[PDB]
Write an enzyme that holds these catalytic residues in place. Structure first.
Site, PDB file in Angstrom:
ATOM      1  N   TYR A 291      -3.336  14.771  -2.837  1.00  0.00           N
ATOM      2  CA  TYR A 291      -4.008  14.188  -1.785  1.00  0.00           C
ATOM      3  C   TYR A 291      -5.146  14.783  -1.245  1.00  0.00           C
ATOM      4  O   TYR A 291      -4.844  15.192   0.201  1.00  0.00           O
ATOM      5  CB  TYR A 291      -2.831  13.737  -0.919  1.00  0.00           C
TER       6      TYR A 291
ATOM      7  N   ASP B 234      -9.979  14.227   7.214  1.00  0.00           N
ATOM      8  CA  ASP B 234      -9.135  13.272   6.602  1.00  0.00           C
ATOM      9  C   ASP B 234      -8.881  13.477   5.065  1.00  0.00           C
ATOM     10  O   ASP B 234      -8.966  13.085   4.375  1.00  0.00           O
ATOM     11  CB  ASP B 234     -10.110  11.953   6.469  1.00  0.00           C
TER      12      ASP B 234
ATOM     13  N   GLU C 191      -5.479   6.884  -2.505  1.00  0.00           N
ATOM     14  CA  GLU C 191      -5.827   5.969  -1.428  1.00  0.00           C
ATOM     15  C   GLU C 191      -6.477   4.553  -2.269  1.00  0.00           C
ATOM     16  O   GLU C 191      -5.850   3.548  -1.838  1.00  0.00           O
ATOM     17  CB  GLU C 191      -6.705   6.506  -0.436  1.00  0.00           C
TER      18      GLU C 191
ATOM     19  N   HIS D 143       0.928  -1.264   0.094  1.00  0.00           N
ATOM     20  CA  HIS D 143       0.080   0.051  -0.152  1.00  0.00           C
ATOM     21  C   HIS D 143       0.682   1.348   0.139  1.00  0.00           C
ATOM     22  O   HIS D 143       0.721   2.140  -0.702  1.00  0.00           O
ATOM     23  CB  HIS D 143      -1.216   0.021   1.160  1.00  0.00           C
ATOM     24  N   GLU D 144       1.805   1.305   0.784  1.00  0.00           N
ATOM     25  CA  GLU D 144       2.638   2.751   0.975  1.00  0.00           C
ATOM     26  C   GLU D 144       3.567   2.630  -0.074  1.00  0.00           C
ATOM     27  O   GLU D 144       3.598   3.876  -0.532  1.00  0.00           O
ATOM     28  CB  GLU D 144       3.135   2.480   2.561  1.00  0.00           C
TER      29      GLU D 144
ATOM     30  N   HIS E 103       1.690   4.129  -2.778  1.00  0.00           N
ATOM     31  CA  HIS E 103       1.830   5.871  -2.922  1.00  0.00           C
ATOM     32  C   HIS E 103       3.295   6.477  -3.755  1.00  0.00           C
ATOM     33  O   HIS E 103       3.203   7.547  -4.028  1.00  0.00           O
ATOM     34  CB  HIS E 103       2.072   6.269  -1.660  1.00  0.00           C
TER      35      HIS E 103
ATOM     36  N   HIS F 133      -9.502   8.599   3.080  1.00  0.00           N
ATOM     37  CA  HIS F 133      -9.568   7.215   3.533  1.00  0.00           C
ATOM     38  C   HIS F 133     -11.141   6.572   3.587  1.00  0.00           C
ATOM     39  O   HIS F 133     -11.426   5.563   3.673  1.00  0.00           O
ATOM     40  CB  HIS F 133      -9.176   6.986   5.008  1.00  0.00           C
TER      41      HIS F 133
END
Ligand SMILES: [Ca+2]
Ligand SMILES: [Ca+2]
Ligand SMILES: [Ca+2]
Ligand SMILES: [Ca+2]
Ligand SMILES: [Zn+2]
EC number: 3.4.24.27
Length: 316
Positions: free
Chosen positions: A157, A226, A166, A142-143, A146, A231
């Site tokens: 973002y 957020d 996301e 996931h990270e 990015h 998210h």
């Protein structure tokens, strides 16, 4: 560091034993020379100054509990590198074999993991909500995804483009989980979330509403928390990706599933060829329809399933 490539052995967060590529120069370092310009894992030592020290070990054995988060961060970075290379012919996150750097033991009781613009950063969790975050291959992938997005579409973002950013990371982190093939599923972070409770996770792609996330555009979050719901609203696109892959009927709309490999191909192409910094959901739909058209033809089942999946979540 300059030295020779060696192979160490250690144990990850969940107690699984694995081989790791190390580099020997007086000490054994977590530096894998076999992929691109290297994968480097560092100790942040419970501080927040980054990157910290390149991880050094006296005997090339990594079985102490302190070692475990570094073992997994290093190993799963390598799995993610292989996924992009073998599946998408992409060499590291910039496509030019950039060094992948990760720090573990970031801060104290830090319940998160993130790409900071230059590297990966993992907390150890507080032992209750989370155990060390690098123990989840889907979290690692996931990270790192990015980083891939930052170098390609560069989706901002915030608001809709942020929710896409996301979703893309949830999608490719899930596809990396399936590629590595150890207990794969359509939830995010289940391996590291709440050691006291079976079957939960941070987020579900197959059923976003399980954890409070919208599964249809009519239910989008329109407040400012957020970063405008990056998210939260990712659930709409996650559900569409789930329907494209697996199929199903969602609010009365039926979708023929085309499988994970084609989902990956379609979304990778949209990401790297069609999305831009400010893309909204409806532009994601057009990009994914154009991607499926390039790959499979305009009359294909693939194109038809993409259109159905976006119809099912209210995105026109
Ligand atoms: Ca050791
Ligand atoms: Ca899993
Ligand atoms: Ca998962
Ligand atoms: Ca749990
Ligand atoms: Zn993310």
């Amino acid at each position: 560091i300059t030295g020779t490539s060696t192979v160490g052995v250690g144990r990850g967060v969940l107690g699984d034993q694995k081989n790791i590529n190390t580099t020997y120069s007086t000490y054994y370092y977590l530096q894998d020379n076999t992929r691109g310009d290297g994968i480097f894992t560092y100790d942040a030592k419970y501080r927040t100054t980054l990157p910290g020290s390149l991880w050094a070990d006296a005997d090339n054995q990594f079985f102490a509990s302190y070692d475990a988060p570094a073992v997994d961060a290093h190993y799963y970075a390598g799995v993610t590198y292989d996924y992009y290379k073998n599946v998408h012919n992409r060499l590291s996150y910039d496509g030019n074999n950039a060094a992948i750097r990760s720090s573990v033991h970031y801060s104290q009781g830090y319940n998160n993991a993130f790409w900071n613009g230059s590297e990966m950063v993992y907390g150890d969790g507080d032992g209750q909500t989370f155990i060390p975050l690098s123990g989840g291959i889907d979290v690692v992938a996931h990270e790192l995804t990015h980083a891939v997005t930052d170098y390609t579409a560069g989706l901002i973002y915030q608001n809709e483009s942020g929710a896409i950013n996301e979703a893309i990371s949830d999608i490719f982190g899930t596809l990396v989980e399936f590629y590595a093939n150890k207990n794969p599923d359509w939830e995010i972070g289940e391996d590291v979330y709440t050691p006291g409770i079976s079957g939960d996770s941070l987020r579900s792609m197959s059923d976003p509403a399980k954890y409070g996330d919208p599964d249809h555009y009519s239910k989008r979050y329109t407040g400012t928390q957020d970063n405008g719901g990056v998210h939260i609203n990712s659930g709409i696109i996650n559900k569409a990706a789930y329907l494209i892959s697996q199929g199903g009927t969602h609010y009365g709309v039926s979708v023929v599933g085309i499988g994970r490999d084609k989902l990956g191909k379609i979304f990778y192409r949209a990401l790297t060829q069609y999305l831009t910094p400010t893309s909204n959901f409806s532009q994601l739909r057009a990009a994914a329809v154009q991607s499926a058209t390039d790959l499979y033809g305009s009359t294909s089942q693939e194109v038809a399933s993409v259109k159905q999946a976006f119809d099912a979540v209210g995105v026109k």
